[PDB]
Amino acid sequence: SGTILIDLSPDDKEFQSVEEEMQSTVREHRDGGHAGGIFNRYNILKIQKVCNKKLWERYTHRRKEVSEENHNHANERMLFHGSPFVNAIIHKGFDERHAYIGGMFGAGIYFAENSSKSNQYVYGIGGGTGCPVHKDRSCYICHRQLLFCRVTLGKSFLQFMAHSPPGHHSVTGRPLALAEYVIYRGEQAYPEYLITYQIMRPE
Numbered sequence: 001s002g003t004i005l006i007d008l009s010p011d012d013k014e015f016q017s018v019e020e021e022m023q024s025t026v027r028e029h030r031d032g033g034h035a036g037g038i039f040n041r042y043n044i045l046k047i048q049k050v051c052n053k054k055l056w057e058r059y060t061h062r063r064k065e066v067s068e069e070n071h072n073h074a075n076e077r078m079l080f081h082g083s084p085f086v087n088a089i090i091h092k093g094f095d096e097r098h099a100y101i102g103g104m105f106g107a108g109i110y111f112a113e114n115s116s117k118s119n120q121y122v123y124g125i126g127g128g129t130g131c132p133v134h135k136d137r138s139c140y141i142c143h144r145q146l147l148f149c150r151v152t153l154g155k156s157f158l159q160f161m162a163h164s165p166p167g168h169h170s171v172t173g174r175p176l177a178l179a180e181y182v183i184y185r186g187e188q189a190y191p192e193y194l195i196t197y198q199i200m201r202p203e
């Protein structure tokens, strides 16, 4: 593995930006915290820059080729990613071959602009079985990990499917409607930050 993790100081403006974006993008969900638990804040334990030359080259190469297909704009966004595979993604990069064959928008890799949305997928689809220790989707004890990723959306197809529709590079969903984003190529996302956190008990 060529992956290096740069621990960021909490007083670092880079840490604070990722910290603020995580806290500020929390929303009240329609499922009442069934999937991701009950909280309005996080305990931010650690934020690490993910450095991997091979993975960066894979991303920038795809970003250029999506750019030339989409009027010389990549449509690059910073989005959150939750999945039980974070530990794999930071070493191997995103891999569409492991996508959930049955999903709202087919076998793609899902991102959110709301940290609390990505939180719902950390322990599986709809929080799966919860934390491995307590089997609790609302565990305040167990440490969770999100990625904050550079994602190339390109020309995004709006939907309310194996690959992007023709002429398109991604899908934007809006099923309290919140925006999800799907790609069908792992090279269209770079996992830039690894965020280790807990959900905070309110009171």
Ligand SMILES: CCOc1ccc(-c2nnc([C@H]3C[C@H](NC(=O)c4ccc5cnccc5n4)C3)n2-c2ccccc2F)nc1
Residues within 6 Å of the ligand: 082, 083, 084, 085, 088, 089, 092, 093, 094, 095, 096, 098, 099, 100, 103, 104, 105, 108, 109, 110, 111, 121, 122, 124, 125, 186
């Ligand atoms: C609204 C429908 O609900 C959702 C929400 C999120 C996702 C999703 N998005 N991304 C994923 C993960 C699969 C994909 N896997 C990898 O990138 C990856 C990368 C390297 C891997 C190495 N070894 C084993 C597995 C590996 N997996 C990220 N998943 C995902 C896939 C399977 C199970 C849970 C998931 F969150 N799928 C459906």
Ligand SMILES: [Zn+2]
Residues within 6 Å of the ligand: 131, 132, 133, 134, 135, 136, 139, 140, 141, 142
């Ligand atoms: Zn737990």
